[PDB]
Design a protein around this ligand. Structure first.
Ligand SMILES: CC(C)(COP(=O)(O)OP(=O)(O)OC[C@H]1O[C@@H](n2cnc3c(N)ncnc32)[C@H](O)[C@@H]1OP(=O)(O)O)[C@@H](O)C(=O)NCCC(=O)NCCS
Ligand SMILES: CC(C)(COP(=O)(O)OP(=O)(O)OC[C@H]1O[C@@H](n2cnc3c(N)ncnc32)[C@H](O)[C@@H]1OP(=O)(O)O)[C@@H](O)C(=O)NCCC(=O)NCCS
Ligand SMILES: CC(C)(COP(=O)(O)OP(=O)(O)OC[C@H]1O[C@@H](n2cnc3c(N)ncnc32)[C@H](O)[C@@H]1OP(=O)(O)O)[C@@H](O)C(=O)NCCC(=O)NCCS
Ligand SMILES: Cc1cn([C@H]2C[C@H](O)[C@@H](COP(=O)(O)OP(=O)(O)O[C@H]3O[C@H](C)[C@H](O)[C@H](N)[C@H]3O)O2)c(=O)[nH]c1=O
Ligand SMILES: Cc1cn([C@H]2C[C@H](O)[C@@H](COP(=O)(O)OP(=O)(O)O[C@H]3O[C@H](C)[C@H](O)[C@H](N)[C@H]3O)O2)c(=O)[nH]c1=O
Ligand SMILES: Cc1cn([C@H]2C[C@H](O)[C@@H](COP(=O)(O)OP(=O)(O)O[C@H]3O[C@H](C)[C@H](O)[C@H](N)[C@H]3O)O2)c(=O)[nH]c1=O
Lengths: 259, 259, 259
């Protein structure tokens, strides 16, 4: 192991082998840090979380194989998060409570995953992605930058279950999936699209389009939407909302010029 | 601190500062009692729960600020509940497992919150409220006395997400929201209304009215409903159901005369 | 107690009385094994799980009554599962994380229950049943062999809530309930039926029938369904899918001849 003198490791913490904990990481009461886990500088790991959780192969003979987990700098991981090995999480990651993240998954920077969320294996999550409470993200899902998944959203992948050939969902830049929506396997949700709350999305959703219902149906251009309090046009949301975004201190247009 | 000699504190328990535990409180294995938490007499706190959980400001510099949490008398809090500071919970509170309750929230007396439920910040819950399994209660929601939220209900608050101006839902006295229903932001569910299972509630629901569907539509007066086993009129439910209610030992009419 | 010399009991484990742990059982960090729990040979019990969790009667006077829990051979129980007393689980059981299983419940062999699932009391689950992530199974539900419940499915039981007379759902052999579906009380889902994702099932679903929508409506024979990748007829699924099934090494027809 390699643990920094500035790291704060509370009691009850259990540490395995081939563990690297950088500078100013704080590991709260009772976490279990299994083998092959690397936590980058400045991170906070919440009470009782279990990092580098066992992949299936461990159970064959109870011998833990090597499946490195890396968590980027300055994470703010809340209590009891369970994160599998063979996964990579970028910088400035934040979570709510009791989140579960599987193996062979990649999560970008400045991503937020809320309480109870369940990220399966072989998932791709980009940067500045916001996944709220109890969202189910099935294997093979691809979530592009700036997408928002509201509470209780479920992204599926078996088109005619149970079957052998899975098709993951792809959610393109800035699309928002409102709460309690379920997306069917292999569907493409296009850029700046809006899936209304509770929808059952059975077909691809075209860019800048709003769909609602079971089955979801297109009701209009996202541009038609007016803020309910101020009467202003809302979407694309990048010009009306910037809390926690990279253009927070400027404006989208200037920011995107620079990138 | 101030801990009663009659309190039973199991092992693994971790206690912070400015903690007050009254008489005959029982704190099960491994709970973490962070600073500024007051647990009233007779309460049971389940294994591994974490009380007075850190608000966001702690993370600025890892210095825990003062945000008192008070839990009323005779709570029956199950395992692994996470409850934030700056919140008040009344007497005879009961929970299921792994419930999460945020800050700046107020919960009345004789309230029940089930397994996995997630109560966000700035929520108001009255008395004799029953929230069943895995209900998501968003910030600014106002839940009046005697309301029932069935498993997987989700109360939302961002009308055109992501946006800055939130509108909480208000659920009036005795209304029942059946399972897997989602309520849109700022909706008013009126007294004795019934939201049928799985509904997507997009408009206010008038008193004593039953709505179903996606989007929910009024189908009839709640009074039209017959018990499926006995054929008797069901609603208002206060005259047909009294298990755990304050008129349990009498009758509604006599009881309400007295209050 | 009766604990095998071959059992591996990690630290932090807490064991009560009248506990029997067979040969080659492995109990991971911090589990709490309350009284009257019998874990059969070869089982793995994940970190921080709590087995033989207290029934309601304990709380009367904080005296734990006798409600035996038995877990069959070779379980693979993941972290933080909470399992009540007065319940029986068969052999080769596997779970995801943070699953909750209530009392007076019976679970067969080769059953899988995923992350966050919540099994209430007085539930019946047969063999080779697959319950995926965050499924809510209400009391009195009867789930027959080979049934699949996809993420976020919810089986209800109070027909006109809150009421006193509950009616459990019955899911017959091999039926599949797709994700985010809710089934109303007392409904019968017949053999080899398919409930499409997100459905609101308000009426019995006839054998080999596919229903979709809110409220769910019959759209066709399950036999009409073609695999989306291969174009082949999918159902009954027993002839097209066999991963983890008892006819995995043979074929259904030969297998069922033998049983
Ligand atoms: C997409 C959305 C913004 C559109 O709502 P809207 O602007 O209020 O649409 P309208 O109020 O103009 O209603 C338009 C019509 O579509 C219906 N409708 C609106 N949203 C619907 C939905 N999610 N599902 C089904 N029907 C819907 C309305 O009932 C109305 O139908 P009607 O007048 O014929 O009876 C809204 O459905 C939504 O999803 N809000 C997000 C809630 C959320 O999840 N926030 C994040 C979590 S806090
Ligand atoms: C509101 C409720 C009681 C009405 O159910 P109901 O009395 O069976 O209504 P009916 O059986 O008379 O059916 C009336 C019509 O409305 C439809 N309907 C009933 N409930 C519906 C629902 N929740 N969503 C959509 N449609 C619904 C029925 O299919 C029928 O339609 P149809 O005959 O044209 O095909 C029921 O929907 C419900 O919510 N039960 C609560 C289940 C629950 O969540 N319990 C608590 C958790 S245990
Ligand atoms: C039942 C199911 C297989 C049928 O999907 P399907 O074969 O794609 O049906 P189709 O694509 O031929 O679409 C048929 C029609 O029914 C509609 N439809 C399909 N599934 C629907 C659903 N779940 N709810 C409502 N409508 C649905 C389609 O939109 C189309 O309507 P339209 O053409 O008039 O606009 C699918 O709904 C489903 O449930 N897949 C399972 C997803 C899942 O939960 N997997 C397990 C978790 S990974
Ligand atoms: C900040 C914080 C978050 N969380 C969890 C709760 C949620 O599951 C997840 C995100 O919570 P958050 O307060 O950061 O919420 P936000 O992601 O900021 O979402 C808000 O803004 C959105 C645009 C929408 O308007 C939404 N309705 C609002 O809640 O993280 C905690 O558990 N504790 C915390 O202290
Ligand atoms: C009593 C008890 C409750 N709980 C959790 C389970 C649920 O999430 C929540 C409420 O469970 P509960 O048994 O007290 O159920 P109730 O609130 O009594 O709801 C029942 O009555 C309602 C009218 C409806 O008919 C409903 N379908 C029934 O389950 O608390 C436990 O985890 N363990 C327990 O021992
Ligand atoms: C194997 C495994 C499962 N689990 C949990 C995750 C789920 O909640 C539950 C089942 O996960 P699983 O990988 O065994 O999935 P399966 O039950 O194999 O389901 C797959 O195959 C089905 C036919 C459908 O195509 C489905 N979309 C696929 O995911 O157990 C873990 O937490 N860790 C694990 O390592």
């Amino acid at each position: 192991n390699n643990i920094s003198k500035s790291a704060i490791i509370k009691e009850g913490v259990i540490i395995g082998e081939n563990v690297t904990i950088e500078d100013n990481v704080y590991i709260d009461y009772g976490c279990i840090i299994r083998d092959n886990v690397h936590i980058k500088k400045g991170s906070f790991i919440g009470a009782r979380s279990i990092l580098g959780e066992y992949l299936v192969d461990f159970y064959n003979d109870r011998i833990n194989k090597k499946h490195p987990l890396i968590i980027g700098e300055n994470a703010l991981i809340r209590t009891e998060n369970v994160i599998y090995g063979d996964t990579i999480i970028g910088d400035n990651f934040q979570t709510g409570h009791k989140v579960t993240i599987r193996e062979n998954t990649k999560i970008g920077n400045n991503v937020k995953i809320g309480t109870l969320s369940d990220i399966q294996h072989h998932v791709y999550i980009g940067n500045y992605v916001n996944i709220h409470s109890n969202v189910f993200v099935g294997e093979k899902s691809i979530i592009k930058d700036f997408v928002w998944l509201f509470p209780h959203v479920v992204l599926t992948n078996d088109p005619t279950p149970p079957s052998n050939e899975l098709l993951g969902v792809t959610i393109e830049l800035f699309a928002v999936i409102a709460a309690r929506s379920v997306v069917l396997p292999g569907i493409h949700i296009n850029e700046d699209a809006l899936v209304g709350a509770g929808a059952v999305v059975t077909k691809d959703v075209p860019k800048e389009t709003v769909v609602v219902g079971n089955p979801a149906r297109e009701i209009c251009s996202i541009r038609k939407i007016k803020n309910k309090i101020t009467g202003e046009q809302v979407y694309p949301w990048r010009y009306t909302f910037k809390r926690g975004m990279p253009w927070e201190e400027t404006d989208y247009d200037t920011w995107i010029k620079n990138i």
